[PDB]
Amino acid sequence: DVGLQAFQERLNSYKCITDTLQELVEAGHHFEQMLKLSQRLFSIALYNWLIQVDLADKLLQVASPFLEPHLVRMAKRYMDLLWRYYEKNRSFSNAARVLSRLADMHTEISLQQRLEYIARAILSAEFLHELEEKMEVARIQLQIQETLQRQYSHHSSVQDAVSQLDSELMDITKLYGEFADPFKLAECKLAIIHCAGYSDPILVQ
């Protein structure tokens, strides 16, 4: 490719810089020098170094103009990067957009968190349109999930359903057909159709 050799060589030097940084632990003068340098592989590498250390919180602090692109590229234990990112964005709009994606994301994150993301995202209030619908559908799953516990028709081993529920937002029809009808949750079904806004009186009745 462009030649790999350059890459391998620099990394050794970079490791040296990181290695030296570690030894430092008049700490500040040393660090600011590194950050206040123009080298986008260096900084990206530095950040990568920081994440390994679990220095990641410190990352929020770093001003460097290089940092923003670093987070963005890395954005998709990345979740920490994202927890970092929405927090990173002082701006409300940018922060919200991330948490939304956070919730929507395909890595396993509990619904409670998915909702906490939405609760956070909503607070930061068409993006709004998507966020609110999300909150509504998510809530339904929570309700369905809660009922599943009470229901005695269920088997503990068919935990899979809960995993599915907490795991992600689901299609309304999927929620309706798969869950509500088979588990006869009439109330849930009704609420769901509310959100859908299904008017048909016969079916509703």
Binding site: Q164, M170, T173, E178
Partner: protein, 738 residues
């Protein structure tokens, strides 16, 4: 993520059977495991909405939702993934389920093909992550995790066995494919000892598990190619194992380790390694400990019970290595065994020291039916050495398995020939004969140990005689006389003996000598008055037990084939073959009421075969297209006579009514053929044959056949069946009946 679709894996596989780097580069999907997604609750809500997305989206109907849900429950799998599975495969009833297993099936196979087949860039690519190696053990564990059983237990009520078996099949094959992969790696020679220890632990977690055999294809070759592993590592394992002798519970580990030692000796014969170690402490002491720790029984067990090629070849190498490198140990055990017993021993006491014999059995079971391997023993005059040595261990306990082991070797017609030469030329057959004779004398004069030796004795003679050719005649000359004498004595072995004698039975005119023996042996103690039953009593008295009868039937069957001499039994009783058939009446008549089913068919088949032969045993066409005497003599007459009897025809008929192992199927064929022959020449018997000799007429048979409807219906049903013998003949019968 990974493509949940079956098709790409299938196509790629066909390519290799073309390899496109592009598809292969898709790469890591050959993870094996579906580790990351299990059933997800979060995923369910997404699904229930009926709108789902894939890693475009699709609307999902209620029907599809249910199929998806069943999958998640059945395979603890993520709901969305389950969806992709359904989409990929044609949607039909539980199509997703199929894709799920299929996806895994070729993925494992491809990995297997690459690792085993290829030496290559790609082989390097697959291995390089060093993702596959990590996953291999876990993949195995994934199969193991009890999902199926719990469901069954829960299921017990409305059980669905069929769907379960489907799953069980796919998984078993997967484990089998996994076995090849692990083996392939060994050939591939990954880096070192750490894996072996982990693997040994992994296997240990599983002693009765049959599954252990799958691993037996990884370990043995691994030990075999100790040279590849670095000496530093080999030395460490050596020390590790020695300390490790504990494991009284892990029989399996003990055996594996023992195998390691077997291999180590060869490897250690490099001057660096060998000089350092002390033979007594380093090898013999521990190996001896392993044998004590039931290492041998384990090896025998694996052999007894049972990717055949890797297993057979690799195991064969182990067994041979054991023979060549190990003999100091064998001698040690041999001497040990001779001394231990002292002139009430329970079977368990006998078996304790029996480790050497167990080795012999190991050989017998492993080699049996594998003529490719068996030949090696006799091809050049160490295995050959091994036999000679085994031949010289006189104690009856060892002597017996020795006989058995050889029998296993004798399998090929070709090998049987060598076995023939072995005794004949380079123990001799006659000595064998002499021993049989000696036992005969002791038993009669007196009037388990012997049974053990004798049973083996017969087993060996029988195996060779059947396979051999002209040698059969020679063997006939040493064993026939002694063989006959032995049968006379009452032994529990008589049945076995008859089987052997039958094997000797020659097709030619030469046969008459044997006939004399048999007639002498039913008639010898007989009080035969002028009823018919008296003759029957003669046989029944002699053939008291079932094994006796089974053996008798086999012997008669062989003899009957172009059977016997004239005026049989002259002087002793009324002459002729006829009384033998009447005896069959006793058998065939209470055959139907046989208490084991397997046993039932066992007896029934021989009689049917004899039945058929006897019918053939006349040439009806000569008439159709000393004569009186000849017509009197053939068994065909008596056969027809009895067949007409209603218990006889009926029994034959039901065989047809109730049709379908494959063995049972043969019985059916004979039933049909028999009836056809009767119908064809029923007329000949009635008008040609019967008057010559002369007892009673025909009618009962027809009403049973023509009027029983089911028989007619069943035969009709048979025509369709692809056994041509059954179908072709079934067709003929209806013709004759009409």
């Amino acid at each position: 993520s990974a493509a949940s679709l079956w098709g790409p894996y299938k196509d790629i596989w066909h390519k290799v059977g073309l390899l496109d780097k592009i598809l292969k580069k898709h790469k890591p999907d050959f993870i094996s495991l579906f580790k990351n997604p299990p059933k997800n609750v979060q995923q369910h809500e997404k699904v229930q909405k009926a709108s789902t997305e894939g890693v475009g989206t699709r609307l999902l109907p209620e029907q599809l939702i249910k199929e998806a849900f069943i999958l998640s429950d059945l395979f603890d799998i993520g709901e969305l993934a389950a969806v992709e599975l359904l989409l990929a495969g044609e949607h039909q009833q539980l199509v997703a389920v199929l894709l799920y297993w299929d996806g895994k099936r070729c993925i494992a196979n491809s990995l297997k093909a690459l690792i085993q087949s290829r030496r290559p860039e790609l082989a390097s690519m697959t291995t390089r992550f060093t993702g596959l190696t990590y996953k291999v053990l876990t993949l195995v564990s994934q199969i193991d995790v009890n999902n199926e059983f719990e469901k069954l237990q829960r299921e017990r009520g409305l059980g669905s066995e069929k769907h379960r078996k489907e799953v069980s099949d796919l998984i078993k094959e997967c484990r089998q494919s996994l076995a090849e992969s692990l083996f392939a790696w060994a050939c591939q020679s990954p880096l070192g000892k750490e894996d072996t220890l982990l693997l040994i632990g992994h296997l240990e977690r599983v002693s009765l598990d049959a599954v252990n055999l799958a691993l037996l294809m990884a370990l043995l070759y691994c030990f075999d190619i100790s040279f590849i592993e670095q000496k530093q590592y080999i030395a460490t394992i050596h020390s590790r194992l020695q300390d490790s002798q504990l494991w009284k519970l892990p029989g399996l580990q003990a055996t594996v380790r023992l195998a390691w030692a077997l291999a180590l000796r060869g490897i250690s014969q490099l001057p660096d390694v060998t000089a350092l170690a002390e033979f007594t402490e380093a090898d013999e002491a521990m190996a001896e400990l392993a044998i004590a720790d039931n290492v041998f029984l384990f090896l025998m067990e694996s052999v007894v019970v049972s990717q055949e090629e890797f297993y057979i070849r690799r195991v064969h190498n182990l067994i041979t290595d054991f023979l060549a490198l190990m003999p100091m140990k064998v001698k040690q055990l041999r001497n040990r065994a001779d001394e231990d017993a002292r002139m009430m021993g329970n079977e368990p006491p006998i078996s304790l020291r029996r480790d050497l014999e167990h080795l012999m059995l190991l050989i017998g079971e492993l080699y049996k039916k594998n003529p490719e391997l068996a030949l090696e023993y006799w091809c050049p005059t160490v295995l050959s050495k091994f036999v000679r040595q085994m031949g010289d261990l006189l104690p009856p306990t060892i002597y017996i398995p020795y006989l058995k082991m050889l029998q296993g070797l004798a399998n090929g017609p070709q090998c049987a020939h060598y076995c023939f030469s072995l005794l004949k030329v380079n123990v001799s057959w006659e000595h064998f004969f002499h021993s049989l004779m000696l036992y005969h004398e002791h038993l009669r004069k007196d009037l388990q140990k012997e049974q053990d030796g004798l049973i083996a004795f017969l087993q060996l003679t029988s195996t060779i005689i059947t396979w051999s050719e002209n040698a059969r005649l020679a063997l006939c000359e040493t064993p026939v006389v002694v063989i006959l004498g032995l049968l006379q004595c009452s032994i529990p072995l008589k049945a076995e003996l008859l089987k052997t004698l039958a094997a000797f039975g020659k097709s030619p005119e030469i046969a008459a000598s044997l006939w004399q023996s048999l007639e002498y042996t039913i008639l010898q103690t007989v009080r035969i008055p002028s009823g018919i039953e008296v003759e029957l009593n003669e046989i029944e008295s002699r053939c008291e037990e079932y094994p006796l009868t089974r053996a008798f039937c086999q012997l008669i069957s062989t003899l009957v084939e172009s059977s016997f001499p004239s005026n049989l039994g002259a002087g002793l009783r009324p002459p002729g073959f006829d009384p033998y058939l009447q005896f069959l009446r006793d058998s065939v008549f209470r055959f139907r009421t046989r208490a084991r089913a397997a046993e039932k068919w066992e007896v029934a088949e021989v009689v049917l075969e004899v039945f058929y032969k006897l019918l053939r045993d006349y040439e009806p066409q000569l008439e159709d297209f000393g004569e009186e005497i000849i017509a009197y003599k053939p068994p065909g007459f008596s056969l027809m006579y009895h067949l007409l009897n209603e218990p006889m025809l009926e029994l034959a008929l039901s065989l047809l009514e109730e049709g379908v192992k494959k063995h049972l199927e043969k019985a059916v064929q004979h039933c049909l053929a028999l009836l056809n022959l009767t119908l064809q020449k029923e007329n000949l018997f009635m008008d040609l044959l019967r008057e010559s000799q002369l007892v009673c007429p025909l009618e009962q048979l027809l009403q049973g056949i023509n009027p029983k409807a089911d028989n007619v219906v069943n035969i009709a049903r048979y025509l369709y069946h692809g056994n041509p013998e059954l179908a072709f003949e079934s067709a003929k019968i209806l013709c004759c009946i009409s």
